[PDB]
Amino acid sequence: DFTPDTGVIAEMTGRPMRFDSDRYRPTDTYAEVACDKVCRAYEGLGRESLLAFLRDLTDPWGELPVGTPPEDACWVSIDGMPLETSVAWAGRKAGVRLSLESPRGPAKRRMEDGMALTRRLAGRPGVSVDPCLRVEDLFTDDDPQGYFTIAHAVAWTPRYKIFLNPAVRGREQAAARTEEAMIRLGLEQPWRALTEHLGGAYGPEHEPAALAMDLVPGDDFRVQVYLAHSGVSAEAIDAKSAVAADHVPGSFARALRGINGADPEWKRKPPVTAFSFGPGRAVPGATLYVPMIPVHGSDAAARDRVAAFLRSEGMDAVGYEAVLDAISDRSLPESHTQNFISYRGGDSPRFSVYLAPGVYR
């Protein structure tokens, strides 16, 4: 949580973008791309209403032409697009999610668009935005710093989450804003347990980079704190999640080493642990996020290694590859769209892949 050689990376933010797609016309709208990407994800898993849902959800920018790159890349996708598709497998369930972030600028405006969407979600079936509004001032400012401020995701079975940036006013304050948010939400107990497990402080070795929460009421409510791990071994990362309710000793270290090799310029993108908190749960759960592009030279190279890992865990590698194949617009050895995968082992294993549309370069 200090120097520029640590923490999360800019990805496409701050860089100029050109449209470059074999699949989409420049006149296709953001909402149409999203609709297409989501349908193709379900296809890999084995439409007029969906596009209307998504145009609604992304209103107004959803009608903007994809062919005209934003002044400012979004951070939700590594190719700077305002949308990122993910597919998640949990135990015997599998489903599709879409994350989204306003492409509009500048940052205060993009933030405000995000605040506006929260309020348009407030009245939707099963949604509660009260916990979000309780902590929202900790993550917003007139002059927001960092790579993002507010993004959202929808998951269909519609469930919504919000992503918030504790580094909105600098990395040095991230832990404090995170802590205050956890206390306000009544999650002081598991937060303390995590904090004490990590040694009582937060630095680049386990740095609060994002706070997410499911926008729902009741014991179902869930907060995730994402900690980026700059400059530490696979074994050290594994040890950090030993406080977790669902910790499997060595599992994270094995996934990290197995998929991403030993800790070289393109391994600047730090691995991340998502600690998940809920009401009446005294310690968090933990989920591992393994960096894909650009640690790996292409989606094909990443795919081979992730497929081999899934198999050794006895998880469904065929479904993962089918999703990659269905959703990707380029031949995989020349494709660079996988952002992360996430993983948890044990008796209720979880695997997810997060995919840039692959439209901007």
Ligand X SMILES: CC(C)[C@H]1C(=O)N[C@H](CO)Cc2c[nH]c3cccc(c23)N1C
Residues that bind ligand DST (CB under 6 A): 84, 86, 88, 99, 153, 163, 342, 352
Applying CB under 6 A, the site for ligand X has a residue count of 16
Phi, psi of 234 (to 5 degrees): -60, -40
The nearest distance, CB 170 to ligand DST, in angstroms, is 20
Rounded Cα distance between 98 and 83, Å, is 7
Q: Answer yes or no whether residue 269 interacts with ligand X by CB under 6 A.
A: yes
Contact (Cβ atoms closer than 8 angstroms) between residue 357 and residue 37: yes
Residue position matching structure tokens 């020349």: 334
Nearest to 138 by CA among 191, 112, 175: 175
If DSSP codes are grouped into helix, strand and coil, which group holds residue 345? coil
Nearest residue (CB) to ligand X, 24 versus 340: 340
- Residue 124 burial by Cβ neighbours in a 10 Å radius (0-12, 13-18, 19+): middle
Q: Answer yes or no whether residue 289 interacts with ligand X by CB under 6 A.
A: yes
Nearest to 303 by CA among 287, 315, 318, 289: 318
The nearest distance, CB 209 to ligand X, in angstroms, is 4
Rounded Cα distance between 286 and 255, Å, is 14
The nearest distance, CB 196 to ligand DST, in angstroms, is 24
Nearest residue (CB) to ligand X, 253 versus 288: 288
Which range, of 3-11, 64-72, 107-115, 168-176, touches ligand X by CB under 6 A? 3-11
Helix axes 30-45, 48-58, angle to 10 degrees: 130
The nearest distance, CB 153 to ligand DST, in angstroms, is 5
Q: Preceding residues of all breaks in the chain (C to N beyond 2.5 angstroms)? A: 46, 157, 263
Nearest residue (CB) to ligand X, 320 versus 340: 340
Rounded Cα distance between 167 and 146, Å, is 6
The nearest distance, CB 199 to ligand DST, in angstroms, is 25
User: Is the backbone of residue 14 left (phi > 0), alpha (psi -120 to 50) or beta?
Assistant: left
Those residues with Cβ within 8 angstroms of residue 96's Cβ, 6 or more apart along the chain or in another chain: 38, 41, 42, 45, 85, 86, 87, 88, 155, 156
- What does 42 interact with, of ligand X, ligand DST, none (CB < 5 to 8 A by kind)? none
- Which one among 84, 113, 205, 238 touches ligand X, defined by CB under 6 A? 84
Beta bridge partners of 287: 274
Nearest residue (CB) to ligand X, 9 versus 64: 9
The nearest distance, CB 74 to ligand DST, in angstroms, is 11
Contact mark string toward ligand X, 210..249, x via CB under 6 A = x---------------x-x---------------------
If DSSP codes are grouped into helix, strand and coil, which group holds residue 174? helix
The nearest distance, CB 338 to ligand X, in angstroms, is 10
The nearest distance, CB 125 to ligand X, in angstroms, is 25
Q: By Cβ distance, which residue is nearest to ligand DST?
A: 99
Nearest residue (CB) to ligand X, 172 versus 219: 172
Nearest residue (CB) to ligand X, 111 versus 210: 210
Contact (Cβ atoms closer than 8 angstroms) between residue 310 and residue 216: no
Which range, of 6-14, 63-71, 259-267, 324-332, touches ligand X by CB under 6 A? 6-14
Span 129-188, contacts to ligand X by CB under 6 A: none
Contact (Cβ atoms closer than 8 angstroms) between residue 323 and residue 353: yes
- What does 9 interact with, of ligand DST, ligand X, none (CB < 5 to 8 A by kind)? ligand X
The nearest distance, CB 339 to ligand X, in angstroms, is 5
* CA dihedral sign, ordered 109, 116, 342, 242: positive
Nearest residue (CB) to ligand X, 100 versus 129: 100
Interface residues with ligand X (CB under 6 A) are 8-9, 11, 75-76, 84, 209-210, 226, 228, 269, 272, 289, 339-340, 354
